């Protein structure tokens, strides 16, 4: 007996060779391989396969190769591939990707993916499943920002702040031991993974290092605290000892040096260059040249992504009003004009497409949108396909190469940069079960269900008073993973090795899972998945023209984007 492919895909999700459109973009992903055995697909419900003695094993105890949770028939989109598989979770971790069921009666069952008495089921047929997004440029300003992030599929926030204090409104910084301790305690109530950055500023080591020992997961160098040669140097000396990452927002004003002076202070050491295009901050006008260097892990923030007809007007005005700049003071106008540049914003689109900028991030509530990292990644990829064509490496008419390049920018690459990719950032065996289910029609726009540590934390779901969960109004809501003490087991506080060795969690009474930051100092650009290109980037000081390999990088702004007015009520 044979099933036609349309029917097959409707019942079990797509299989090898089938393509799926991402939202209302022009981007198509193709199933590369499928772990199933045709006829023994897992599924759950009345008269379905996962029943006792059938696709559910009735013999084995939980310890004996049985899962806590099976996601059936997932279309995985990950740096590691675009493919169809069942996903098995146990003890809050991904333990198996393959084929789940009952070896009693089914062929091809992955040996540790038994569905048993202990196993919960999530149907992922017809869904796209990705890793949770890893946002590494978060300002902790307003706690309402967490749900905003979850609703667009973000599961880890790295950054800093103490709420709407001016220091935090400008910089991703939680300064000093006491503010760090306070925010680690606050974190116990935030239903998302968190790592906190200390202030990467000082001329003596001890004031900086004591932040790491207090529980910071990294540092931020920001011009508003003095992004001087000394602060850069001491922060990187600290980071090299402590095995944490340093992020930089360089000296826009070129007050103590130009870009080459910042690079000399860095002295070949690893650093994460935030908003590398520079509208979000950095040496005017040439900061984006950072993205060509082998020791730089370069990210974009999201409001320049991608380049649209309203971008420049929006950013020039935003910069002026937020810095209290006056339209009639020529120095203020000159500064704004040196910082907000169509030439570098246009080139940033193309640098993403070429794999020269490795990461996305938000800059939430400081100059970026907490809930639009994933959204704008895919709008960028879509614009690049329309303007540049399929990448040369594509085949079968699919956009798989571009899709793996772009999904990397907000999943695995930030995780690698931060020293946390042993725990999060991809759908791989042995990593924490932070998973996002997407209906393809809403892909990258609104997440269906966000799984944190193997339990649903956030879902688009309807009327709680109804006979069933789908009646209106369907909206984003916190689920049981966020409630009571379960918030502790479903989320990770990432901390320095030294703070963990010194017993900071016990001292503060932290009950969350504790994640160790490590392996951040002997990586480089070459470690960025699908985005590993080093090159000489030239930015013309007179025209702001960007050249790579002797060629000017320019593109036009677009008047319309997908993943926009079809979806949003405002």
């Amino acid at each position: 007996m044979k099933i036609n492919r349309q029917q097959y895909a409707e019942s079990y999700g797509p299989t090898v060779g089938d393509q799926v459109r991402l939202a209302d973009t022009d981007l198509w992903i193709e199933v590369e391989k499928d772990y199933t055995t045709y006829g023994d697909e897992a599924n759950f419900g009345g008269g379905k396969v996962l029943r006792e003695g059938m696709g559910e094993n009735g013999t084995y105890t939980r310890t004996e190769n049985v899962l806590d949770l099976l996601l059936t028939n997932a279309l995985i989109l990950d740096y590691t591939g675009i493919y169809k598989a069942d996903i098995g979770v146990k003890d809050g971790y991904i333990v198996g990707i393959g084929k789940g069921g009952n070896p009693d009666i089914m062929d091809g069952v992955t040996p540790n993916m038994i569905v048993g008495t202990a196993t919960e089921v999530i149907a992922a047929e017809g869904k796209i499943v990705t890793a949770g997004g890893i946002d590494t440029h978060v300002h902790f300003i307003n706690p309402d920002q967490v749900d905003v992030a979850l609703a667009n599929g973000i599961t880890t926030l790295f950054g800093g702040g103490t709420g709407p204090a001016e220091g935090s409104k400008a910089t991703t910084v939680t300064p000093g031991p006491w503010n760090i301790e306070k925010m680690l305690k606050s974190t116990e109530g935030l239903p998302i993974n968190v790592g906190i950055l200390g202030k990467g500023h000082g001329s003596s080591i001890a004031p900086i290092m004591e932040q790491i020992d207090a529980g910071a997961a990294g540092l931020k160098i920001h011009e508003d605290w003095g992004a001087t040669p000394a602060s850069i140097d001491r922060s990187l000396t600290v980071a090299d000892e402590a095995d944490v990452q340093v992020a930089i927002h360089s000296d826009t004003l070129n007050e103590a040096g130009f870009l080459e002076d910042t690079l000399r202070a860095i002295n070949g050491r690893v650093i994460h260059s935030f908003h590398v295009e520079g509208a979000g901050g950095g040496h005017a006008p040439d900061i984006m040249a950072m993205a060509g260097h082998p020791n730089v892990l370069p990210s974009s923030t999201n409001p320049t992504r991608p380049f649209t007809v309203n971008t420049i007007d929006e950013h020039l005005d935003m910069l002026m009003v937020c810095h209290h700049l006056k339209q009639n003071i020529p120095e203020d106008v000159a500064f704004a004009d040196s910082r907000i540049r169509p030439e570098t914003i246009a080139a940033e689109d193309i640098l993403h497409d070429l794999g020269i900028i490795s990461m996305m991030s938000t800059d939430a509530l400081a100059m970026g949108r907490a809930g639009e990292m994933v959204l704008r990644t895919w709008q960028t990829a879509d614009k690049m396909k329309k303007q540049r064509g399929p990448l040369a490496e594509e085949k079968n008419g699919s956009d798989n190469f571009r899709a793996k390049r772009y999904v990397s920018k907000y999943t695995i690459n930030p995780a690698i940069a931060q020293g946390i990719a042993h725990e999060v950032g991809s759908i791989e065996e042995g990593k924490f079960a932070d998973l996002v289910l997407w209906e393809p029609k809403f892909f990258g726009v609104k997440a269906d269900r966000v799984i944190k540590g193997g339990i649903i934390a956030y879902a688009q779901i309807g009327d709680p008073s109804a006979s069933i969960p789908t009646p209106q109004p369907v909206m984003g809501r916190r689920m049981y993973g966020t409630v009571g003490d379960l918030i502790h087991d479903t989320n990770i506080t990432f901390m320095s090795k030294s703070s963990i060795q010194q017993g900071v969690p016990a001292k503060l009474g932290l009950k969350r899972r504790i994640g160790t930051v490590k392996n951040c100092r002997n990586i480089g650009k070459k470690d960025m998945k699908w985005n590993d290109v080093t090159t000489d980037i030239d930015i013309n000081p007179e025209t702001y023209e960007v050249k790579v390999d002797g060629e000017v990088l320019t593109c036009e702004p677009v008047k319309e984007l997908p993943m926009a007015q079809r979806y949003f009520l405002f």
Binding site: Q472, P473, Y567, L569
Partner: protein, 100 residues
């Protein structure tokens, strides 16, 4: 008033529907949440009027047509569900393929 949680929530649907109807009145093709809100509010107001579940299943298919909404919206909406208090208590209405 003694509002319960559902009554509080469902005020939002009415509000979104009013917003959407304003947008339609000034000539805009409606988007996905606008369309859902209009049809949902229609169902709940119909229940309040004392229509039957069967009447609302029929009528809900003729509240908006293709030419009222953006490209792709008809195919995004497979069905719209709402619960409301009919004269004979709460009932569920499902409108299948509301926009052809």
């Amino acid at each position: 008033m003694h509002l319960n949680p559902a009554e509080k929530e469902k005020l939002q649907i009415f509000l979104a529907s009013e917003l959407a109807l304003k947008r339609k009145a000034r000539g805009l093709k409606l988007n996905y949440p606008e369309a859902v809100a209009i049809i949902t509010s229609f169902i709940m107001e119909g229940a309040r009027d004392g229509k039957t579940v069967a009447m609302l299943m029929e009528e809900g298919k003729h509240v908006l047509t293709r030419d009222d909404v953006m490209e792709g919206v008809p195919e995004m909406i497979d069905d719209i569900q709402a619960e409301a208090t009919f004269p004979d208590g709460t009932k569920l209405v499902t409108v299948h393929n509301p926009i052809s």
